[PDB]
Amino acid sequence: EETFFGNFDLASLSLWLFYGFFALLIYYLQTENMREGYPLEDEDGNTAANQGPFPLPKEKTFKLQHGRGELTLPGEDVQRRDNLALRKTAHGNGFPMEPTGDPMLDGVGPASWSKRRDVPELDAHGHPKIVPMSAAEGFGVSAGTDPRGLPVMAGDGEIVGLVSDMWIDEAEQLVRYLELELDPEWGDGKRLVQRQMVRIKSDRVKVRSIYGKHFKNVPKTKSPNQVTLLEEDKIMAYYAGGTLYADESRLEPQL
Amino acid sequence: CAIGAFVSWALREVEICRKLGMGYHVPFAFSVAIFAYVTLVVFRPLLMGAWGHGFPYGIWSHLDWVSNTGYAYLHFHYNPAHMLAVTFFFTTTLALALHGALVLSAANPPKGEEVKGPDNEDTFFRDFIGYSIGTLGIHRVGLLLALNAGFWSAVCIIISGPVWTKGWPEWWNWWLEMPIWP
Amino acid sequence: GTGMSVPEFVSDLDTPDPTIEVFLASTSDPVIPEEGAQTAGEAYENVDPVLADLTVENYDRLLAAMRSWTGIPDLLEDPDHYQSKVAINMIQMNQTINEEWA
Amino acid sequence: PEYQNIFTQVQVQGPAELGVDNENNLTEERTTGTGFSQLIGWIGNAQLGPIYLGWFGIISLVTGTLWFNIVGFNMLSQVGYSIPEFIRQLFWLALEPPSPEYGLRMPPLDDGGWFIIASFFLLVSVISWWLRTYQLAEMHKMGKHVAWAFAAAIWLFLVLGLFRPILMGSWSEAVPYGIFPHLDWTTAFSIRYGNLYYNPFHALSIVFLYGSVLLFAMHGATILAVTRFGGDRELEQIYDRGTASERAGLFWRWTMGFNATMEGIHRWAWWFAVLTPITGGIGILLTGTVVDNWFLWAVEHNFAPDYTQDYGYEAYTTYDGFLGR
Amino acid sequence: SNSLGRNCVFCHNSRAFYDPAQHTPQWATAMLGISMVQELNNEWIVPIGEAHLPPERLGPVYNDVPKLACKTCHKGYQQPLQGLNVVADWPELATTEGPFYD
Ligand code: BCL
Ligand code: BCL
Ligand code: BCL
Ligand code: BCL
Ligand SMILES: CC[C@H]1c2cc3[nH]c4c(c3C)C(=O)[C@H](C(=O)OC)c4c3nc(cc4[nH]c(cc(n2)[C@@H]1C)c(C(C)=O)c4C)[C@@H](C)[C@@H]3CCC(=O)OC/C=C(\C)CCC[C@H](C)CCC[C@H](C)CCCC(C)C
Ligand SMILES: CC[C@H]1c2cc3[nH]c4c(c3C)C(=O)[C@H](C(=O)OC)c4c3nc(cc4[nH]c(cc(n2)[C@@H]1C)c(C(C)=O)c4C)[C@@H](C)[C@@H]3CCC(=O)OC/C=C(\C)CCC[C@H](C)CCC[C@H](C)CCCC(C)C
Ligand SMILES: CC[C@H]1c2cc3[nH]c4c(c3C)C(=O)[C@H](C(=O)OC)c4c3nc(cc4[nH]c(cc(n2)[C@@H]1C)c(C(C)=O)c4C)[C@@H](C)[C@@H]3CCC(=O)OC/C=C(\C)CCC[C@H](C)CCC[C@H](C)CCCC(C)C
Ligand SMILES: COC1=C(OC)C(=O)C(C/C=C(\C)CC/C=C(\C)CC/C=C(\C)CC/C=C(\C)CC/C=C(\C)CC/C=C(\C)CC/C=C(/C)CC/C=C(\C)CC/C=C(\C)CCC=C(C)C)=C(C)C1=O
Ligand SMILES: COC(C)(C)C(=O)C/C=C(\C)CC/C=C(\C)CC/C=C(\C)CCCC/C(C)=C\CCC(C)CC/C=C(\C)CCC=C(C)C
Ligand SMILES: [Fe+3]
């Protein structure tokens, strides 16, 4: 084969064309990923003087099901929190924040929740997606150990109550939450725990993230038959905040 | 220096995970790549008896090492562990393509149409092939496939020098000469 | 750094070729010819390639070497056997290998 | 330790899910009958079936079965119809492409005709399967991403078997149908045209394959680590952002200085996987038709390394020294 | 490779199998051996045996006279008998002309 000039043949031309295409593709991919969380701010809440090398993308629109309307991004941050019990530890940028009161009750740090919609998630029929097992037709335990009736163990080794029900996902056939009935010495009412923070044994259920005295302050649901997205975010954030805030030794250096 | 840097990177990831309140899956997954690198530069030269068995640090010169090491066992495609590792690599790539495609197709319908949900995805794959793994099983399967790819790559390289010395086609003589054949 | 090397098991490197000791148990030193020594042609009826050898060399080559290196105990006894005719050519082939392919 | 969410602790089972429908009436062609497997329920869904039966699926099944049977019966006849010897040599047999002397003409059945018939049936089967995957997404009122990513692999498939042999002018350039015999073709192809390492498109293909495996490891680990916040429900996180997405983004932002969104990570994944066969096919199509020795090409373009030391064992050791005498 | 008990990087830098400047010194000896084997097969071994050998030495198909190759002498070692000197004791097999017992 012949060369146009020097060593330039078809392979070199293909290589250079691919280089140009890949540059354009990298630009597109980076731009598509800036639809949430922009523009940037400083630690005092004001818009930062620096905004980056890549400009912001144009707007796209989603059409939601069950008559919830439209969503256009990028836009205003509707999931933003209003009053945070946090304090600055330096006059400049780049340093941590310090909780003002109780981080577990105020929802800061690893205990943070996002402000989602106050409605339950639906399935294709238009019904609430997550339902207690007592109101699911034809469902039952098919394998593994049934946890209903077993006692619940706290992270410090205290028995706080018993498992009274399970909340399952009918469309996907999976268990999402475990419902507990608290003893009078450890609070009143019922609480939910996500299935991803428990270990089911032959005689007990173990929850290691929070202690016995933390179980009365778990956020509660408004209704006994459904849970909204906000409530779920608030409940799971509470359980995850204990991995750092339950004990003073969990926060200080381990060495 | 490189070993120190890689271990420091993993421990920094652990500290970030702890501060954010997450699980430690990402540092554990990175540990397997670290293990493959350490097998390439530490364990195999140690078993073979010389530091000179490691690959050089050059963009185009570390391919010559792979070529010459592959041709020192004659036909390297006949290594069974290499076969397993190659299969895992191909399957991981296919699964990633399918997963990305399904999620994008759910979130981005044709113009003028409402978005879809997990029920729709489950229905597309049961219609397509008769089984659906679910939105939680696909992530487990992808992680397991990638980790298996790394582990079997390490095994395949570590058996070539210190455990087997002849050519790799000769290994199948156990199958070719079983007593059960006439 | 190029990866060009040959691996071998250490225990295999210490096991020699088992046929080396067999050759050393069947070889002997040559005998320097004397002045006007009797040849093999004048004592028997043999073929020309091995006819001009000495007598002692003829013994130490015929039996001590060829009848043990190939396992034929009566080799070159009957001149009409096919083995004798093949061996006569093989002597010349060996000489050619040692001379023209050094 | 804490639960890691790799195997499910307890399983529940209800009525079988027959699937959604619309005016397109998908229920008409669906089979009736489902099963449950408790062994695969530890890792994913337990339900098996049902399936969709169309014209494209049936055509693809029949043609693929025909291709398989032609290859198998040729392999069986090549050994004398001896079943024990057919089993003994299964990995070494193949159905071989025609000889180079026939060009693009039709060869005899003894020397490649069966190969051509089997290739035609396999091509029909694969194209019919692609048509089925397009039609299902059209009837479900979804996007066409699955079909486009299957078409990217079909591109390398077609380049390997159809386009390059036509460009070179011989059916003898195709790949034999066998296990050890196709791995022999791979090695011989690499040796014949120099060194395939020094093909820049082979290097780009390796880049994208490595990157796709790395990306799947990262994404799987990240989603499993935020599942305690309901992170595996990705679509609802796209429609209504929650704390799982924020934590997942902030991890990688604090690690390497930039991050993605819940929807944008799948675009990255889709492109890295699809770019592998495209660059691979471009590289394969350029070999033999444009470049005939890739190492000499690298020498010409000045990216082949140079070595100073000597060759041979006598420059480093001694034969007696290696043997230990 | 199976005849000498070595691998490919013995005699070759596999990044360029064609290049004469990337070969080792054992590649020239192999090149000489190819011609030597061709000559031995076509001039000495095949022509005899076709005239004397009995039918029980002719092989399954084609009824062929046996032939030799690399492994007939090397037998899986880098050198035949690992380099033993076998010609110093036998001057009669070293040259075509009269033996030199000097
Ligand atoms: C003649 C050549 C032989 C051959 C010789 C070999 C040899 C020899 C080897 C393999 C190896 C492999 N072969 Mg093979 N192989 C051949 C042909 C093939 C073919 C094919 C024909 O299609 C395929 C698909 C493969 C593929 C493979 C994989 C199974 C495997 C790759 C290792 C890996 O991914 O570990 C991935 C893991 C790593 C090593 C990555 C480590 C990453 C580290 C921890 C992070 C570094 C950070 C970095 C510095 C940061 C920079 C960025 C910053 C901005 C600075 N082989 C041919 C036939 N093959 C290799 C293997 O398995 O080794 C383990 C190997 O050594
Ligand atoms: C890319 C360069 C070479 C090539 C490089 C390699 C290398 C290198 C290897 C494979 C290996 C395999 N190759 Mg090949 N192979 C190529 C192209 C193909 C094509 C094709 C384009 O039609 C097919 C059907 C196959 C298929 C196969 C299987 C025989 C085997 C398993 C790997 C695999 O698919 O895992 C990925 C799996 C998926 C993506 C999907 C999983 C679905 C099933 C498993 C598909 C397999 C097909 C089936 C086994 C083929 C018929 C076999 C009979 C039923 C007995 N190869 C190209 C031409 N091939 C491996 C091997 O031989 O291991 C023993 C191996 O190491
Ligand atoms: C894995 C088994 C073999 C191997 C087989 C191959 C083969 C075969 C190929 C590569 C190729 C590459 N190899 Mg190598 N390579 C090996 C081990 C390594 C190691 C290591 C463990 O330290 C590194 C860092 C590399 C790096 C590289 C890149 C230079 C290149 C692109 C692949 C890639 O990273 O994309 C995957 C990962 C990403 C997409 C993440 C991005 C990482 C970037 C691109 C890499 C930066 C490396 C940098 C230039 C070197 C270090 C700089 C220091 C900071 C000073 N190789 C081992 C020995 N390597 C390809 C090549 O040469 O292309 C031209 C190629 O064809
Ligand atoms: C000695 C061997 C040569 C070599 C020879 C080749 C050759 C030859 C080729 C590769 C190719 C590839 N090489 Mg290379 N390669 C070498 C060494 C390596 C090494 C290494 C040493 O580390 C690596 C990592 C690789 C890696 C790769 C891949 C990146 C690439 C394959 C693309 C792909 O997506 O495959 C995935 C495979 C496919 C998608 C094939 C198509 C599959 C279709 C879709 C199957 C249809 C379905 C089927 C028919 C039906 C099944 C029935 C079921 C039961 C239902 N090579 C050495 C240098 N390499 C290929 C390439 O693209 O090169 C540019 C190629 O052709
Ligand atoms: C099966 C496991 C797969 C995997 C997983 C994996 N990799 C990972 C992770 C995970 C889960 C991370 O979390 C981590 C990350 O942060 O990714 C963004 C990472 C990572 N894997 C990376 C790369 C990488 N992964 C690879 C492969 C894989 N990664 C596997 C396929 C490969 C190859 C060759 O296929 C590469 C190149 C990095 C982008 C990143 C971590 C790198 C890092 O930050 O290292 C810290 C150190 C530095 C900043 C630079 C150190 C420089 C040295 C001191 C000098 C150079 C030495 C080197 C040996 C020279 C090499 C020269 C070459 C020419 C050979
Ligand atoms: C890796 C992806 C490939 C793939 C795989 C695949 N096919 C599958 C499955 C999977 C993972 C199933 O789970 C499902 C099945 O039931 O397998 C036993 C199936 C199936 N899809 C099929 C068609 C099919 N899909 C195809 C495509 C593909 N699917 C991809 C190439 C093709 C090809 C290659 O063109 C065909 C021919 C059959 C192989 C099988 C038929 C299933 C069916 O008709 O309906 C669902 C099942 C029932 C009728 C009820 C249960 C009876 C089962 C058929 C047997 C197993 C029952 C047992 C009690 C459980 C044991 C565990 C099982 C996992 C084996
Ligand atoms: C982006 C590139 C990657 C990729 C992508 C990719 N592959 C794909 C897709 C995508 C996006 C599909 O949508 C499609 C699919 O169906 O996925 C489930 C597919 C697919 N990729 C496949 C194979 C494949 N992909 C490969 C590679 C890759 N795929 C790349 C890594 C490879 C290799 C070598 O690495 C292979 C071997 C198939 C599983 C499937 C295409 C199915 C197809 O076309 O089938 C045609 C039908 C036949 C030939 C009939 C066969 C008849 C059989 C003899 C019996 C009947 C089938 C039965 C179910 C099998 C036997 C079961 C036993 C229990 C009896
Ligand atoms: C759903 O969920 C998910 C997400 O979310 C939504 C995600 O997003 C992601 C993430 C995925 C993507 C974003 C897709 C794209 C990803 C890839 C293609 C992967 C490959 C990645 C790369 C090629 C890039 C990786 C880059 C690396 C590793 C280099 C970055 C590192 C550095 C620059 C150094 C780090 C800095 C350190 C250690 C601190 C500095 C040290 C000090 C002591 C501070 C003191 C200061 C100084 C000494 C001087 C000042 C220092 C400076 C300025 C630092 C910079 C350095 C310089 C030299 C200038 C996934 C998977 C996910 O599933
Ligand atoms: C006899 O026993 C029974 C009945 C049980 C059997 O049936 C047994 C069967 C077997 C044991 C079968 C075994 C089969 C294999 C091991 C098969 C292996 C096959 C491969 C590895 C195939 C690879 C194929 C292709 C590759 C690598 C690349 C590209 C190919 C193509 C693009 C093919 C397409 C061809 C075309 C378009 C040419 C068509 C020509 C025209 C003129 C239209
Ligand atoms: Fe995902």
Token pair recorded at residue B127? 């219609």
Torsion over CA: A48, A52, A55, A57 (sign)? negative
Cross-chain residue pair E26–D312, CB shorter than 8 Å: yes
Residue D60 one-letter amino acid = S
Supply A75's token pair. Answer: 């836009």
D202 annotated ligand-binding residue? yes
**D183: its two tokens:** 């791995």
Please name the chains neighbouring C, where neighbouring means 3+ C-beta pairs under 8 angstroms: B, D, E
Distance (Å, whole) CA D114 – CA D70: 8
Give residue A30's identity as a one-letter amino acid code. Q
Which of B128, B115, B99 is CA-nearest to residue D26? B128
D307 and C2: CB-CB below 8 Å? yes
Does the distance separating the beta carbons of D255 and B12 come in below 8 Å?
Answer: yes
Q: Is the peptide bond before D50 cis (omega within 30 degrees of 0)?
A: yes
Residues B37, B154 contacting (CB under 8 angstroms): no
Distance CA B133, CA B110 (A): 25
What's CA E64's distance to the chain center, in Å? 20
D69 lines ligand 2 (CB under 6 A): no
Cα D118 to averaged position of ligand 9 atoms, centre (Å): 7
Q: Which residue's entry shows tokens 């250079």? A: A16
Query: CA–CA separation, A13 vs A94, rounded Å?
Result: 47
D175 C-alpha to ligand 9 centroid (Å): 9
The token pair that represents E68 in the structure block: 């030799």
SS3 for A159-213 is: EEEEEEEEEEECCCCEEEEEEEEECHHHCCCEEEEEHHHCEECCCCEECCCCCHH
CB D87 within 8 A of CB D36: no
- Which among C5, C6, C80, C90 is the top mutation candidate for probing chain E, defined by the most E β-carbons within 10 Å of its own β-carbon? C6
3-state secondary structure chain D: CCCCCCCCCEEEECCCCCCCCCCCCHHHHECCCCEECCCHHHCCCCEECCCECCHHHHHHHHHHHHHHHHHHHHHHHCCCCCHHHHHHCHHHCCECCCCHHHCCCCCCHHHCHHHHHHHHHHHHHHHHHHHHHHHHHHHCCCCCHHHHHHHHHHHHHHHHHHHHHHHHCCHHHCCCECHHHHHHHHHHHHHHCCCHHHCHHHHHHHHHHHHHHHHHHHHHHHHHHCHHHCCCCHHHHHHCCCHHHHHHHHHHHHHHCCCCCCCHHHHHHHHHHHHHHHHHHHHHHCECCCECCHHHHHHHCCCCCCCCCCCCHHHCCCHHHHHCC
Amino acid at B96: L
Report how far ligand 10's centroid is from the alpha carbon of D263 (Å).
9
Pairing of β A97-99 and β D35-36:
unpaired
SS3 content of chain A, % helix, strand, coil (to 5): 25, 25, 50
Indicate which residue's Cα is closest to atom 33 of ligand 7.
B90
DSSP 8-state secondary structure symbol assigned to residue C21: H
- Asked if residues E94 and C98 have their Cβ atoms less than 8 Å apart, the reply is yes
**Of residues B48, B61, B161, nearest to C1 (C-beta):** B61
Distance CA A72, CA A59 (A): 6
**Ligand 9 neighbour D97 (Cβ under 6 A):** no
Which string of b and e fits C8-25 if b means at least 16 CB within 10 Å? eeeeeeeeebeeeeeeee
Inter-CA distances, D125 with A151, B56, D55, D182, E53, Å: 58, 46, 12, 21, 58
Residues of E in contact with C64 (CB under 8 A): none
Contact C52, E22 (CB under 8 A): no
Task: Tell whether residue D182 is among the known ligand binding residues.
Answer: yes
Q: How far apart are CA D82 and CA A137, in angstroms?
A: 58
Q: How far is B167 from A67, CA to CA, in rounded Å? A: 68
Contacts of C42 (CB under 8 A, 6+ apart): none
The four Cα atoms A223, A227, A230, A233 give a dihedral, to 10 degrees, of: 130
As given in the structure block, the two tokens for residue A199 are 């270990």
* Six token digits for residue B170: 């000769």
Amino acid at A180: L
CA–CA dist D126, D124 (Å, integer): 6
D226 lines ligand 8 (CB under 6 A): no
Q: Which tokens is B132 given?
A: 């659906």
Residue in this structure with the two tokens 């084997």, named with its chain if needed: E37
> β-pairing, D47-48 with D35-36?
antiparallel
Residues of B in Cβ contact (< 8 Å) with A171 = 118-119, 122
Angle CA D150–D156–D162, to nearest 5: 115
Q: In the numeric block, which tokens belong to residue E32?
A: 């000489």
B45: buried, middle or exposed (CB in 10 Å: 19+, 13-18, 0-12)? middle
Number of C to E CB contacts under 8 A, please give it: 72
Q: Hey, what are D325's tokens?
A: 């005498």
Residue for token digits 């990255």? D268
- CB distance A33 to D264 below 8 Å: yes
User: Is residue A160 within 8 Å of residue A183, measured between CB atoms?
Assistant: yes
- Residue C3: CB atoms within 10 A of its CB come to 22
Backbone dihedral region for residue A138 (phi beyond 0: left; psi -120 to 50: alpha; all else: beta): left
Contact A24, A4 (CB under 8 A): no
CA distance E95 to E91: 7
On chain B, the residues whose CB falls within 8 A of the CB of E24 are none
Q: Which residues of D touch B58 (CB under 8 A)?
A: 305
Residue nearest atom 34 of ligand 3, based on CA coordinates: D207
* Alpha carbon distance D84, D88 (integer Å): 6
With touching defined as 3 or more inter-chain CB pairs under 8 Å, the answer for chains C and B is yes
Q: What value does the CA radius of gyration of chain B take, rounded to a whole number of Å?
A: 22
A chain contacts of residue B20, beta-carbon cutoff 8 Å: 110
Q: Are A246 and A103 in contact (CB under 8 A)?
A: no
| A220 Cβ neighbours under 8 A, 6+ residues apart | A189, A190, A191
* DSSP 8-state secondary structure symbol assigned to residue A41: B
Q: Which chains form contacts with chain A, at 3 or more CB pairs under 8 Å? A: B, D
Residue C32 CB contacts under 8 Å (≥ 6 apart), including other chains: E101
DSSP for A100-141? SS-HHHHT-GGG------SS--B-TTSSBSEEEGGG-TT-EE
Q: How far apart are CA E74 and CA E3, in angstroms?
A: 7
Q: Which of residues 8-37 of C touch B (CB under 8 A)?
A: 8-9, 12
Q: What's this structure's resolution in Å?
A: 2.4
Return the residue of E nearest to B62 by Cα.
E15
Answer whether B66's CB lies under 8 Å from B55's CB: yes
- Give the separation between CA D294 and CA D200, rounded to whole angstroms: 9
State the Cα–Cα distance between residues A8 and A16, nearest whole angstrom: 11
Asked whether D189 and D176 are in contact (CB, 8 A), the reply is: no
Contact A84, A108 (CB under 8 A): yes
Q: What is the DSSP string of B151-168?
A: HHHHHHHHHHTTT--S-S
Smallest CA–CA distance, residue E62 to chain D, in Å, is 20
Distance CA A130, CA A225 (A): 9
Distance from the Cα of D173 to chain A's closest Cα (Å) equals 20
Amino acid at D189: F
Per-residue burial over E70-84, b = 16 or more CB atoms within 10 Å of its CB, e = otherwise: eeeebeebbeebeee
Q: Which residues of D touch A114 (CB under 8 A)?
A: 241-243, 246
Q: Which ligand is nearest to the CA of B25?
A: 5
Q: How many CB atoms lie within 10 A of CB D33?
A: 10
User: Which sign, positive or negative, has the C-alpha torsion C73, C79, C80, C85?
Assistant: positive
H/E stretch holding A70 reads strand A70-73
Q: Which chains have 3+ CB pairs within 8 A of D?
A: A, B, C, E
| Backbone CA torsion sign across D248, D254, D255, D256 | positive
- Return the DSSP state at C89: H
Q: What is the token pair recorded at D282?
A: 């471009």
Is it true that the peptide bond before A74 is cis, omega within 30 degrees of 0? yes
Query: Position D273: which residue type?
Result: A
**Which residues, judged by CB distance below 6 Å to any ligand atom, belong to the binding site of ligand 3?**
B 37, 40, 55, 59, 62-63, 66; D 203, 206-207, 210-211, 214
Vertex D221: Cα angle to D215 and D222 (nearest 5): 85
CB atoms within 10 A of CB B48: 15
Residues 6+ apart with CB under 8 A from A194: A176, A177, A178, A235, A236, A239, D228, D230
Peptide bond into D97 cis (omega under 30): no
Sort out which chain B residues have CB atoms less than 8 A from C2's CB and list them.
56, 61, 64-65, 68
Q: What length does chain E have?
A: 102
- Say if E22 is an interface residue toward chain B (CB within 8 Å): no
Facing C13 at nearest CB: one of D307, D311, D324: D324
- Asked if D146 contacts D137 with a C-beta cutoff of 8 angstroms, the reply is yes
Tokens for D299? 């020498």
Q: Which amino acid is at A153?
A: M
Residue A167, Cβ density class (10 Å: 0-12 exposed, 13-18 middle, ≥19 buried): buried
Q: What is the DSSP string of chain E?
A: -TTTT--SSSS--TT-SS-GGG--THHHHHHHHHHHHHHHIIIIITTTTTTT--GGGS-SSTTPPP---HHHHHTTSSSGGGG---SSS-GGGT-SSS----
CA atoms within 13 A on the CB side of D174: 25
Q: Is D33 left (phi over 0), alpha (psi -120 to 50) or beta?
A: left
Q: Which two tokens stand for residue E26?
A: 């054992």
β-bridge pairing A70-73 and A60-63? antiparallel
Phi-psi region of D224 (alpha: psi -120 to 50; beta: other; left: phi over 0): alpha
Residue with tokens 């291709």: D67
Closest chain B residue to C5 measured between Cα atoms?
A: B72
The residue contributing the CA closest to ligand 2 atom 27 is: D179
Instruction: Establish whether residue D209 lines the binding site of ligand 4, counting it when its CB lies within 6 angstroms of any ligand atom.
Output: yes
Report whether residue D265 contacts ligand 8, using a CB cutoff of 6 Å: yes
Q: Which amino acid is at D155?
A: W
Interface test with A, best of D3, D4, D7, D10 (most A CBs within 10 A): D10
Taking alpha carbons only, the member of D118, D147, D124 closest to residue D58 is D124
Which position has the token pair 């999402």?
A176
- Non-local (6+) Cβ contacts of D224 within 8 A are B23, B25, B139, B140, B143, D4, D5, D6
Q: Give the Cα separation of B129 and D196 in Å (integer).
A: 36
Structure tokens at C75: 């080799």
Residue A32 near residue D267, CB atoms below 8 Å? yes
Q: How close is the nearest chain D Cα to the Cα of E9, in Å?
A: 10
Report the C-alpha gap between D267 and B105 in whole angstroms: 11
Pocket test for ligand 2, best of D163, D183, D278 (most atoms within 8 A of CB): D183
Q: Which residue has the tokens 């996500």?
A: A194
Residues E77 and E4 sit within 8 Å (Cβ to Cβ): yes
User: Could you give the CA distance from residue B140 to residue D219 in angstroms, rounded to a whole number?
Assistant: 10
Closest chain B C-alpha to C14 CA, distance in angstroms: 16
Which residue in B26, A141, A187 sits closest to D38, CA to CA? A141
Distance CA(D171)–CA(D105), nearest Å, equals 8
Pocket test for ligand 2, best of B90, B92, B172 (most atoms within 8 A of CB): B90
Which residues sit opposite A182 in a β-bridge?
A161
Longest dimension (CA), chain D: 87
What phi and psi, each to the nearest 5 degrees, are found at residue C92?
-70, -35
- Measure the CA–CA gap between C13 and D325, rounded to whole angstroms: 10
* Unique residue bearing structure tokens 């380049």: D159
Pick from C95, C102, D312, D315: which is nearest to E32 by CA? C102
From the centroid of its chain, how far is CA E65?
Answer: 17
Q: What angle separates helix A10-32 from helix D200-225, to the nearest 10 degrees? A: 20
Other CB atoms within a 10 A radius of the CB of residue D253 amount to: 14
| DSSP assigned state of A47 | B
Residues A182 and A189: their CA atoms lie apart, in Å, by 6
Helix (H) or strand (E) holding B18: helix B2-20
Q: Measured between alpha carbons, how far is E57 from E46 in angstroms, rounded to an integer?
A: 13
What angle do helix axes B118-129 and B80-107 make, rounded to 10 degrees? 130
Provide the phi-psi class of D259: left if phi over 0, else alpha when psi is between -120 and 50, else beta.
beta
The experimental technique behind this entry is cryo-EM
Taking CB atoms and an 8 Å limit, are E14 and B167 in contact across chains? no
CB contact under 8 A, E93 and C33: no
